[PDB]
Design a protein around this ligand. Structure first.
Ligand SMILES: [Cl-]
Length: 242
């Protein structure tokens, strides 16, 4: 059911890094990773938490739809793309933390905790500040746990409406061409050691879906592009994409 291929470590060590890639073949119900241990180590989700946060905000009516505009609060931040109005689509595309921080305040501790428990999401622990726990609080999730959660979302099996799940999968759209569709979300965790980058999602093919979750050491922001680049290299090596 699970195969470990330690030779895949070269994808990371060739960049003087370390990490884990986890792949799941939905048709064959088989998993693959370079490192079974790190596949099951729990890290802060950071901006990958925008997936469950979006679902909860939609299902409770905090967010009406993917067109609702969340106005910039006029506070100049160091990420230029954050100093503008957003909707759900652009907020997920540019990982706009302050928009999702307001979602979390409106959701509130009680409803956030119950919903993460309903999702079986990570360690389901929101200890910390309700507007920052996915960045520096107690919540943790592993790469294998990300895949379990994503599989439920793909199949509309989470305990929110079908509509909420369809909208979030639309907002996850990252790449599409004649060969495949990728729906995914990046993450970048710097407030608690070890600093890591994430990329989680799946690849839609004509007759199969491959789920993936990866994290890697990220001592500086200079390496953030390696999250997608390495993952796609693995997908190409394994003949999942051309
Ligand atoms: Cl779509």
């Amino acid at each position: 059911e699970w195969q470990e291929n330690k030779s895949w470590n070269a994808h990371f060590t060739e960049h003087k890094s370390q990490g884990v890639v986890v792949l799941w073949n939905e048709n064959k119900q088989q998993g693959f990773t370079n490192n079974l241990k790190r596949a099951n180590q729990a890290f802060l989700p950071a901006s990958t938490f925008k997936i469950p946060n979006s679902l909860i905000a939609l299902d409770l009516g905090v967010v009406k739809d993917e067109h609702q505009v969340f106005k910039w609060d006029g506070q100049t931040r160091d990420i230029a793309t954050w100093n503008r109005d957003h909707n759900l689509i652009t907020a997920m595309k540019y990982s706009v933390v302050p928009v999702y921080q307001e979602f979390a305040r409106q959701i509130g501790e009680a409803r956030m905790s119950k919903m993460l428990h309903a999702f079986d999401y990570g360690n389901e622990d929101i200890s910390g500040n309700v507007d920052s726990f996915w960045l520096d609080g107690g919540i943790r999730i592993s790469a294998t746990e990300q895949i379990s959660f994503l599989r439920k979302l793909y199949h509309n099996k989470l305990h929110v409406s079908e509509r909420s799940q369809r909208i979030v999968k639309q907002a996850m759209l990252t790449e599409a061409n004649g060969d495949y569709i990728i729906r995914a979300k990046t993450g970048y965790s710097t407030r608690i050691e070890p600093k890591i980058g994430w990329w989680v999602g799946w690849v839609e093919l004509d007759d199969n879906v491959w789920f993936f979750a990866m994290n890697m050491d990220m001592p500086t922001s200079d390496g953030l592009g390696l999250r997608q680049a390495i993952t796609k290299e693995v997908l190409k090596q394994e003949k999942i994409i051309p």
